[PDB]
Chain A
Amino acid sequence: FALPFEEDEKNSDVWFLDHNYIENMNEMCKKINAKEKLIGWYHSGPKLRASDLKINELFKKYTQNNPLLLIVDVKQQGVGLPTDAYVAIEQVKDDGTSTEKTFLHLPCTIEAEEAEEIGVEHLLRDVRDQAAGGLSIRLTNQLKSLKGLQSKLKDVVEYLDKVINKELPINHTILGKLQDVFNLLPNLGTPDDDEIDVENHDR
């Protein structure tokens, strides 16, 4: 549920959040369901700000858990991720740098409630983006997946280009993941790859 909020375009680290409304909400909704307690706050998106780092310290005080930041993309310019989930944590940061406050991405999954499923299918009257039913749906899907793999990979090309040309700081986590990618890359002429070929005859 919404809360009152205000924002400034002169310095962007100037804002209003109302605490008094928050107190009243908690009282009311406990009775509705004893399954609603404070678990964090949504930020309406479409993007993560660095100003959301400061706003986070308010919600960290209100509830004793690290508070979830939930980006709800309502402008939907990304073909995946309509929801991104972020929990602010503190970690020591590459390139000789301090303990910095950061937001670490987690799985942002939908699995749905029982309650929810019933209205969702009902409203639905489309053949769905992906459902993976007949062969027709999965032949579409295979070709969709390939475009998918390429799109992620493209952004990565441009990151490595920019470290060595346009001086964004070197983050060894992203370089390290690529090492791991290359060590789980099947090599032709190994016994693993050769087996794939034989199995294709058999299927």
Chain B
Amino acid sequence: EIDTILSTLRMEADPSLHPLFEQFEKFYEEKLWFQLSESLTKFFDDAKSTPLRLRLYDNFVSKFYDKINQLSVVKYLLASLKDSKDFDESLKYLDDLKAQFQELDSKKQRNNGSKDHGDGILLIDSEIARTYLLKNDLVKARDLLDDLEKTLDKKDSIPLRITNSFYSTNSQYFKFKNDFNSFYYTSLLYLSTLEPSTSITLAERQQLAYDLSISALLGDKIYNFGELLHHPIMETIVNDSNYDWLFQLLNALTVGDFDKFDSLIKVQISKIPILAQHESFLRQKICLMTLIETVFVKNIRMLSFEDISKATHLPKDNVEHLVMRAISLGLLKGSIDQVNELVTISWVQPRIISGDQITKMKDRLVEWNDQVEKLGKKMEARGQSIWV
């Protein structure tokens, strides 16, 4: 029935993919088809580059989809139309299996008294929008993404796997428009909710990584940089030439050293034109980070112009323009004076909190605590006998 097709597929396949065919037939004989899902996924990681995933999956999906979970059918589906070049081709499977799952949820569910099937529709609507972005029909994709987003809020128990697909489709959308800030926040949700049983290879970590990082440097309100050190995706990728400088540029940015920053950017202008055309934004970005960092750890909440003039290594004239941007963006908030030559802030924006910041926070409460105690001892002694 299905035996001939698998036999044609195995002959086309390499000798290293040969035992995986053998296992499909072995498991089929036993009549456990869950064991069959496990094997199938393995095959599709190492054979998405051969065109053989586009015929293998159909045979299994269109018999079992009820003897195997909804996650299994979609798992296969994602890998198959992953590298596919014709989007007209791609659209037709997504629609055929959407209609199938709808029908499934009326019949199986009454009889077993178990098993949902309406979860599977949700994940297909992500992949239709993903397919629309790839045609360069960006706008259209966004109308289904709003519709799915509403459907999601109806649910009070939303899965990881499903919203991981959804945050993803959204993150691709913004960076095609080259919105750096919009991308970075939405990607932080994707990375954090990222599943343990991935659809992400080591090469795909690099490509994602790069998009995370570029946005970080070229932002204008992104001064959370420690969540690329709290995700393996960019954290342990740093040993590649490309990701050596790319990581360094973040460290330079963080610590406010102008010597290191100058050395680094010279190379990255000529080589990369996205760093080149945005080099002005990037340059003023380092300088704004100096302002907020330097006032936080000090227990005063104002700085002179003269302090800043030395700090950013620029004129007293520059100070006016950069400190002004800081109020606009909302990095800082406060009053600016040129007559008394001060900027006295009333707010610092929240950041991700590294080890030195916590030490200074500690030494502040040791000062505080000691005062309450002294103010207290004097008042316990005075009027000791009268409290009635």
Binding site for B on A (CB under 8 A): 92-93, 95-99, 136, 139-140, 142-143, 146-147, 149-150, 153-154, 156-157, 160-161, 163-164, 170, 172, 175-176, 178-179, 182-183, 187
Q: List 8 A-B contacts (CB under 8 A).
A: A92-B189, A92-B193, A96-B191, A96-B192, A96-B230, A150-B369, A175-B357, A182-B364
Binding site for A on B (CB under 8 A): 160, 189, 191-193, 227, 230-231, 296, 300-301, 346-348, 350, 352-353, 355, 357-359, 361-362, 364-366, 368-369, 372-373, 375-376, 379-380, 383, 387-388
B352–A172 CB distance below 8 A: yes
Task: Tell whether A98 pairs with B160 under 8 Å between CB atoms, given A139-B387, A146-B372, A179-B348.
Answer: yes
- 16 A-B pairs besides A136-B388, A157-B362 with CB distance below 8 A are A92-B189, A142-B379, A146-B372, A146-B376, A153-B365, A154-B369, A160-B358, A160-B359, A160-B361, A161-B362, A175-B353, A175-B357, A175-B358, A176-B353, A179-B348, A183-B301
In the complex, what's the smallest C-beta–C-beta distance from B85 to chain A, in angstroms? 34
B355–A164 CB distance below 8 A: yes
Instruction: Please indicate the chain A residues that have their CB under 8 angstroms from the CB of B352 in the complex.
Output: 172
Q: Complex: how many Å from CA A170 to CA B231?
A: 15
A153–B368 CB distance below 8 A: yes
Instruction: Please indicate the chain B residues that have their CB under 8 angstroms from the CB of A183 in the complex.
Output: 301, 346-348
B193–A99 CB distance below 8 A: yes
Instruction: Please indicate the chain B residues that have their CB under 8 angstroms from the CB of A93 in the complex.
Output: 192
Q: Complex: how many Å from CA A22 to CA B189?
A: 40
Report the nearest A residue to B163, measured CB to CB.
Answer: A99
Of B191, B230, B366, B388, which one neighbours A157 at CB under 8 angstroms?
B366
B350–A179 CB distance below 8 A: yes
Q: Complex: how many Å from CA A140 to CA B384?
A: 10
Of B231, B353, B364, B368, which one neighbours A96 at CB under 8 angstroms?
B231
Q: Complex: how many Å from CA A139 to CA B385?
A: 12
Instruction: Please indicate the chain B residues that have their CB under 8 angstroms from the CB of A172 in the complex.
Output: 350, 352-353
Instruction: Please indicate the chain A residues that have their CB under 8 angstroms from the CB of B296 in the complex.
Output: 179
Of B189, B353, B383, which one neighbours A170 at CB under 8 angstroms?
B353
Report the nearest A residue to B157, measured CB to CB.
Answer: A90
Q: Complex: how many Å from CA A143 to CA B376?
A: 7
Report the nearest B residue to A92, measured CB to CB.
Answer: B192
A98–B193 CB distance below 8 A: yes
In the complex, what's the smallest C-beta–C-beta distance from A191 to chain B, in angstroms? 11
Report the nearest A residue to B228, measured CB to CB.
Answer: A96
B361–A178 CB distance below 8 A: yes
A157–B379 CB distance below 8 A: no
Q: Complex: how many Å from CA A161 to CA B361?
A: 10
Instruction: Please indicate the chain A residues that have their CB under 8 angstroms from the CB of B231 in the complex.
Output: 96
Q: Complex: how many Å from CA A179 to CA B348?
A: 8
B193–A143 CB distance below 8 A: no
Instruction: Please indicate the chain A residues that have their CB under 8 angstroms from the CB of B353 in the complex.
Output: 170, 172, 175-176
Instruction: Please indicate the chain A residues that have their CB under 8 angstroms from the CB of B192 in the complex.
Output: 92-93, 96-98
Instruction: Please indicate the chain A residues that have their CB under 8 angstroms from the CB of B227 in the complex.
Output: 96
In the complex, what's the smallest C-beta–C-beta distance from A46 to chain B, in angstroms? 26
A176–B350 CB distance below 8 A: yes
Of B189, B359, B361, B383, which one neighbours A139 at CB under 8 angstroms?
B383
Task: Tell whether A150 pairs with B372 under 8 Å between CB atoms, given A164-B355, A172-B352.
Answer: yes
Instruction: Please indicate the chain B residues that have their CB under 8 angstroms from the CB of A98 in the complex.
Output: 160, 192-193
Instruction: Please indicate the chain B residues that have their CB under 8 angstroms from the CB of A140 in the complex.
Output: 387
Instruction: Please indicate the chain B residues that have their CB under 8 angstroms from the CB of A178 in the complex.
Output: 361
In the complex, what's the smallest C-beta–C-beta distance from B160 to chain A, in angstroms? 6
In the complex, what's the smallest C-beta–C-beta distance from A83 to chain B, in angstroms? 27
Instruction: Please indicate the chain B residues that have their CB under 8 angstroms from the CB of A142 in the complex.
Output: 379
B362–A160 CB distance below 8 A: yes
In the complex, what's the smallest C-beta–C-beta distance from B224 to chain A, in angstroms? 9
Instruction: Please indicate the chain A residues that have their CB under 8 angstroms from the CB of B369 in the complex.
Output: 150, 153-154, 157
Report the nearest B residue to A137, measured CB to CB.
Answer: B387
Instruction: Please indicate the chain A residues that have their CB under 8 angstroms from the CB of B301 in the complex.
Output: 182-183, 187
A-B pairs, top 4 by smallest CB distance, nearest first, are: A96-B230, A160-B362, A175-B353, A150-B372
B372–A164 CB distance below 8 A: no
In the complex, what's the smallest C-beta–C-beta distance from B312 to chain A, in angstroms? 23
In the complex, what's the smallest C-beta–C-beta distance from A148 to chain B, in angstroms? 10
In the complex, what's the smallest C-beta–C-beta distance from B10 to chain A, in angstroms? 39
Of A136, A143, A156, A163, which one neighbours B365 at CB under 8 angstroms?
A156
Report the nearest B residue to A176, measured CB to CB.
Answer: B350
Q: Complex: how many Å from CA A164 to CA B362?
A: 11
Instruction: Please indicate the chain B residues that have their CB under 8 angstroms from the CB of A150 in the complex.
Output: 369, 372-373, 376
Q: Complex: how many Å from CA A92 to CA B163?
A: 12
In the complex, what's the smallest C-beta–C-beta distance from A187 to chain B, in angstroms? 7
Report the nearest A residue to B376, measured CB to CB.
Answer: A146
Q: Complex: how many Å from CA A163 to CA B353?
A: 11
